[PDB]
Amino acid sequence: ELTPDQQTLLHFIMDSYNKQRMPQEITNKILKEEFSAEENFLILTEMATNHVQVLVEFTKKLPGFQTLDHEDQIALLKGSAVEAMFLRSAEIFNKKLPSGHSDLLEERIRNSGISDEYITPMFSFYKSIGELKMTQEEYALLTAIVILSPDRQYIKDREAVEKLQEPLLDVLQKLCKIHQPENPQHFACLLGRLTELRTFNHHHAEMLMSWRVNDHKFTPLLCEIWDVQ
């Protein structure tokens, strides 16, 4: 049984998660545009820059975020952007979302200058997580939880973050006990994704440097979030 003080949190969070979506102007390109390593990379860039925007808006609305040291807020945004993006894309492929054009989107990612050493793990992650049959609420809570990770590098007050994250973890667990009483390991299975997600940050920074020396174009927003001269 979910409490009233908790059912309100989940509602506020589920509310912000569904507030903004990605522009049809952007998502229509996955379908309409030419399939070129160049065009592919540019569409992927456009989507990521845009999502960095939705991420800030979403995070800002997270309960207690705007109260943390402002230098800690940047560290949390800078540290979760890639992971939040893996979760959102995995959700897209997993729920075969219409505005996601999964097959074509996968095409564009499969040919954008990404090393095979990275694509394999990326899609394997997409597959295994899809097989979890996650509910929009699990995606939304794993995202908020990923965003409020106290153990990110350069965090000053790591205790203030834990205080913001623990309430969310509990709501997620309370749900796994309700909608999955048969399978008790479901909660622990969802948290395992937080570790797998971590794993991609090393790979991503490699890619950023690879694309960079190849004179690949990013955006002032992405360069800032991902510390790229």
Binding site: H70, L77, K78
Partner: peptide, 11 residues
């Protein structure tokens, strides 16, 4: 430092 993130956080 971090002009753009700082700006999005104040908007």
């Amino acid at each position: 430092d971090h002009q753009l993130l700082r700006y999005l956080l104040d908007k």
